[PDB]
Amino acid sequence: NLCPFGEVFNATRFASVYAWNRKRISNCVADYSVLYNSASFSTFKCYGVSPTKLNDLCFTNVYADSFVIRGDEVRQIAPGQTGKIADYNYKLPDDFTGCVIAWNSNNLDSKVGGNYNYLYRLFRKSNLKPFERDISTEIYQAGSTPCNGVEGFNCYFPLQSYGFQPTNGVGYQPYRVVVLSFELLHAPATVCG
């Protein structure tokens, strides 16, 4: 039967980028033609593979990651990028194989009084590895004196809220991202086009 890409794309609620969702897709026939030629995507970029080639390829597992970020930040969901998102929230490898798909979700994810449910990690000691997920909410120590879980000077809550309002500039409006990763092991493939 068919791979369930719709449960990822058509989902009514999306994850925050720091707690990005991953759906592991296995043991199914993937119909990329219908998936791609569907909604209108403001961003569609593939690396190491053509979108029109996926129907001929077989993979051991396929990963579909999804989250929400700012408009100005979509450029960071790409190989070899840096910034608050790529460093501290969601990181693709330099040799990334797969596709990044983004579309404006201002009608669904912004609120008149500001949507503060979507967050991104603002402070972190070091950068994330590729495909690493950090859901910690420990107070960030920006100075010498420890925090002991109490916010204060040099002691910051690690996550910040976007506050999406429906009439912000497009650079500040929420965008829904889906990232398709294609895992090729030396094992029998379970996903073919």
Epitope: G83, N127, Q141, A142, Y156, G169
Partner: antibody
Framework: EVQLVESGGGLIQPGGSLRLSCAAS????????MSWVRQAPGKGLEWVSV???????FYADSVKGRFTISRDNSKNTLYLQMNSLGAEDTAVYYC?????????????WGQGTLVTVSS | DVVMTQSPGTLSLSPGERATLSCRAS???????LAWYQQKPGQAPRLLIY???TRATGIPDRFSGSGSGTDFTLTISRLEPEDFAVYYC????????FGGGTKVDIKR
Amino acid sequence: EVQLVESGGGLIQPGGSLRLSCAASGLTVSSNYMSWVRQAPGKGLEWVSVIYSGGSTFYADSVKGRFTISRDNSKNTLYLQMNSLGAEDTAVYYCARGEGSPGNWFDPWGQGTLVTVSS
Amino acid sequence: DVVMTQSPGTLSLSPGERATLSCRASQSVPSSYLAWYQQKPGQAPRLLIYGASTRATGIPDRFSGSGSGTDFTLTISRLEPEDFAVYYCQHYDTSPRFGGGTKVDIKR
């Protein structure tokens, strides 16, 4: 007792290089967003560069390819290497913690040091 | 790519009067991205208000900010001689940006 204390300013010839310093106390340089903002004589503020705690660096278009931001953890000090300097680089250079984004504003600020590019 | 514009260039008021400084934006900027800075002659800039309306630590109560979208306002309720300075608004889109600044001259 939080301070940012700058050094390394003065006279340099056109096309020369110069390294500014920003010694910190009351905060850890390697654990923060650390920025450089500059002010040409009689003019407004201009953001120049930023280093993230994770090591990422970013530069304004007017300095890309010529400036390099860095830090030294053991000395708890921020640096700015300025190469191929010209007349438009003559300014008072401030260092500051933060990047000017929500939850991450420029605070505190260094006292500034003046760089003069002339022959 | 969001340009901000401060107005007026210079402001001339007497002590005790009310000072209104504007920071207009071409596109609508969220309020949590707007900040105000004060720079007195020969000194470094100082953070006055962040998040459009939240007062910075130790800033006197006479300084207040408000606004949203394309129009942000810094208000100095009671103007004092020591308030003579240049005030900049500042926001972040893809990089940090500063407004041109507004000078507050004090009438005497």
